[PDB]
Structure 1
Amino acid sequence: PYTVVYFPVRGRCAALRMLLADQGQSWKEEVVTVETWQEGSLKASCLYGQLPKFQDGDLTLYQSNTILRHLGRTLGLYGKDQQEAALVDMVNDGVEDLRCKYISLIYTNYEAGKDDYVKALPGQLKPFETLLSQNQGGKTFIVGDQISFADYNLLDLLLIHEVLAPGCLDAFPLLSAYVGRLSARPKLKAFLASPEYVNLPINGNGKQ
């Protein structure tokens, strides 16, 4: 089946977990403590010396976006055709870009850079609002009329930014509605309310 090896944080596994849960998939969580990580052996065996590590049967994957694309490809959450698959990629790459900036802030200069980051946020979120406006008036998903792996990734990005900058989505009616809508999907809603998700910190350094 599936197994996700990660530290006890939502971080880069939040989206793939939301995906798995919403899609009714079963998976095993192999929690890696800082102690175990610092020992060195596990890290050494990781392709790029990092987590998450994912296992689908005997297929071992690394890279959160690889895991997302894999599940998307195998679970049919990658568009209806090639054009949509490309658009799904375009959205995900955008999410990744902002996620990297977020991570940089959180771990590199939260205190000094938070204000600047927040002033810049609107411009970083606008693209997704625009994508939504061009897709059935933002009444469905980020791309096409079926959910994709990019949706879960974008939803997580939006959720964590809501924590970082409460109200940041107020200026974006489509994104706000979108978040409320996806969060309301039965299985996802249940997962987001579970201790499994709720009792895990967003990041590893206690900042958010």
Structure 2
Amino acid sequence: PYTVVYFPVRGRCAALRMLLADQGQSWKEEVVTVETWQEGSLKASCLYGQLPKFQDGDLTLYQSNTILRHLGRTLGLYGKDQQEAALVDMVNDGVEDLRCKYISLIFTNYEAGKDDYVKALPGQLKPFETLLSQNQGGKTFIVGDQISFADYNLLDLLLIHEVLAPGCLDAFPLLSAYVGRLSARPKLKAFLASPEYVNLPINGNGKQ
């Protein structure tokens, strides 16, 4: 089946976990503690010396987006045709770029860079509002009318930003409706409210 090996944080696994849950998939969690990591053996065995590590049968993967695209490909959450598949990538890549800046703020300079980051947020979120406005008035999903791996990843990005800069979505009616709508999906709602998600820290450094 599925197995995700990662630290005891949401981080780069939050989105794929949401995906697995909403799709009614069963998976195993292998928690890696800082002590175990600092031992060195696991780090060395990891291709790019990092986690998350994922296992699907005897297929061992690395790189969060690779896991997302894999599930998306295998579970049919990658658009209805090639054109949509490309637009799904365009969204995910955009999500990835903003996630990098978020991760850099959280770990590199939270105290001094928080104010500038928040001021720049509207411009960074705007593109997703625009994408949504061009797809059935943003009443369905980010691309096409069926959900895709990019939705789960975007949803996480928006959620974590709500905690960082509460109210950042008030200026974006479509994104706000989008978050609420998807968060309400039965399997997803139950997952987001469970101890498995709630009691895990967003990032590992105690900052959010």
- TM-score in terms of structure 1 length: 1.00
Q: Distance in 2 between matches of 1:70 and 1:205?
A: 29
Deviation of residue 78 (structure 1)?
A: 0.2
Q: Distance in 2 between matches of 1:23 and 1:43?
A: 31
Deviation of residue 202 (structure 1)?
A: 0.1
Q: Distance in 1 between matches of 2:183 and 2:64?
A: 21
Q: Distance in 1 between matches of 2:157 and 2:77?
A: 18
Give the 3-state SS of the residue equivalent to 1:106 in structure 2.
helix
Give the 3-state SS of the residue equivalent to 1:39 in structure 2.
coil
Deviation of residue 56 (structure 1)?
A: 0.2
- Deviation digits for residues 58-83 of structure 1, max 9, x if unmatched? 00000000000000000000000000
Any stretches of 5+ residues in structure 2 without a counterpart? none
Give the 3-state SS of the residue equivalent to 1:145 in structure 2.
coil
Give the 3-state SS of the residue equivalent to 2:4 in structure 1.
strand
Deviation of residue 129 (structure 1)?
A: 0.2
- Deviation digits for residues 87-129 of structure 1, max 9, x if unmatched? 0000000000000000000000000000000000000000000
Deviation of residue 173 (structure 1)?
A: 0.1
Q: Distance in 2 between matches of 1:82 and 1:76?
A: 13
The root-mean-square deviation of aligned C-alpha atoms, in Å, is 0.2
- Deviation digits for residues 137-196 of structure 1, max 9, x if unmatched? 000000000000000000000000000000000000000000000000000000000000
Give the 3-state SS of the residue equivalent to 2:38 in structure 1.
helix
Give the 3-state SS of the residue equivalent to 1:192 in structure 2.
helix
Q: Distance in 2 between matches of 1:48 and 1:182?
A: 33
Which structure 1 residue ranges, 4+ long, deviate > 2 Å from structure 2? none
* Aligned residue in 2 for 1:137: 137
Give the 3-state SS of the residue equivalent to 1:3 in structure 2.
strand
Q: Distance in 1 between matches of 2:207 and 2:134?
A: 34
The equivalences for 1:49-198 within 5 A come to 49-198=49-198
Any stretches of 5+ residues in structure 1 without a counterpart? none
Q: Distance in 1 between matches of 2:114 and 2:28?
A: 35
- TM-score in terms of structure 2 length: 1.00
Deviation of residue 57 (structure 1)?
A: 0.3
Deviation of residue 10 (structure 1)?
A: 0.1
Q: Distance in 1 between matches of 2:43 and 2:108?
A: 22
Q: Distance in 2 between matches of 1:204 and 1:49?
A: 18
Q: Distance in 2 between matches of 1:15 and 1:175?
A: 17
Give the 3-state SS of the residue equivalent to 1:66 in structure 2.
helix
Deviation of residue 200 (structure 1)?
A: 0.1
* Aligned residue in 1 for 2:201: 201
- Deviation digits for residues 3-24 of structure 1, max 9, x if unmatched? 0000000000000000000000
Q: Distance in 2 between matches of 1:205 and 1:128?
A: 28
> How many corresponding residue pairs?
208
Q: Distance in 1 between matches of 2:78 and 2:12?
A: 19
Q: Distance in 1 between matches of 2:6 and 2:81?
A: 32
Deviation of residue 55 (structure 1)?
A: 0.1
Deviation of residue 54 (structure 1)?
A: 0.1
Deviation of residue 206 (structure 1)?
A: 0.6
